[PDB]
Design a protein around this nucleic acid. Structure first.
Length: 254
DNA sequence: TGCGACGGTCTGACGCTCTACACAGTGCCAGGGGGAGATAAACGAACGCTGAACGCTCCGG
């Protein structure tokens, strides 16, 4: 609320895509219109051609006379948005005139970069606040209810990036000494994510430093059984190494 | 026709890499035809809301 500048236009892509003019929300429109807006936004104001926009929205099988569909989608964007924010260059469209902090993806990138810089500088409270601000950006699943293979690719990429953000965040939480909340939320996540090995290693190191051991090795046994049932292979050697060093009761982690 | 000579025509002028680069002085606008992009509407489609309605276990007086 402290950065609510007058005349500032804010866009939301990390969840359901939305447009905010000075605090009031705009009617984005149809799901394909929303996906076109997302495709034009994530390129950081780079000119995307109409054929590439068609490929991003629809993929391999477009209808024959539906370039005018993208034309009227862009016209509806220019209706909803400013006349000058969306510019037409070389037959394509680009969302220009965006100030800093306008796009939530760029804000997340800057927050992650600042968190990494503070990790390099060793500042725990500052990077903790930066990651707290970062996690308060996306609401629910990214790109909710939009079609297209580009939308699917962005969805899975940003979900994976959020997974690594949670991994780094909670590894730092185990570094600073936050046991209870970490154990609870990682139990919830591994209930949601059954085959994510990194989060389960985080559960192992968290429970080893929290005074709880039985459910830790129970989760580990379930992990090996499910990984053998669904894949037929052996888990990563780092998980076995950390479990072995847990078994010998090494006081370095404690 | 035989003669030299006069002349044009035509050809290549061993092999490779290490190296290896680019190329410069004199007109001007109006009228008209097409297709690129924005517009607002349109015919058809399926997308939702309406809970209703059928049937099940159900705790039960």
């Amino acid at each position: 609320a402290e950065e609510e500048e007058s005349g500032a236009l804010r866009f939301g892509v990390l969840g359901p895509v939305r447009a905010w003019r000075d605090g009031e929300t705009l009617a984005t429109g149809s799901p394909q219109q929303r996906a076109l807006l997302a495709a034009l936004l994530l390129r950081e104001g780079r000119t995307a051609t109409a054929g590439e926009l068609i490929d991003a929205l629809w993929g391999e099988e477009p209808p024959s006379q539906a370039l005018a569909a993208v034309r009227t989608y862009a016209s509806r964007l220019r209706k909803v948005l400013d006349p000058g924010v969306l510019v037409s260059e070389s037959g394509g469209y680009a969302v220009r005139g965006l100030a800093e902090g306008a796009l939530d993806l760029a804000r997340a990138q800057d927050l992650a970069s600042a968190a990494e810089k503070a990790r390099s500088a060793g500042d725990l409270c500052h990077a903790r606040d930066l990651l707290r601000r970062a996690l308060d950006l996306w609401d629910g699943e990214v790109l909710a209810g939009v079609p297209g293979p580009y939308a699917q690719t962005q969805r899975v990429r940003l979900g994976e990036w959020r997974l690594q953000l949670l991994e780094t965040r909670l590894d730092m939480d185990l570094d600073q000494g936050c046991h209870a909340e970490a154990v609870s939320e990682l139990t919830a996540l591994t209930a949601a994510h059954p085959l994510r090995e990194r989060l389960r290693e985080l559960l192992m190191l968290a429970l080893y430093r929290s005074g709880r051991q039985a459910e830790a090795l129970a989760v580990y046994a379930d992990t090996r059984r499910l990984l053998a049932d669904e894949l037929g292979v052996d888990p990563r050697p780092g998980l076995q190494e950390l479990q072995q060093r847990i078994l010998q009761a090494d006081p370095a982690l404690a």
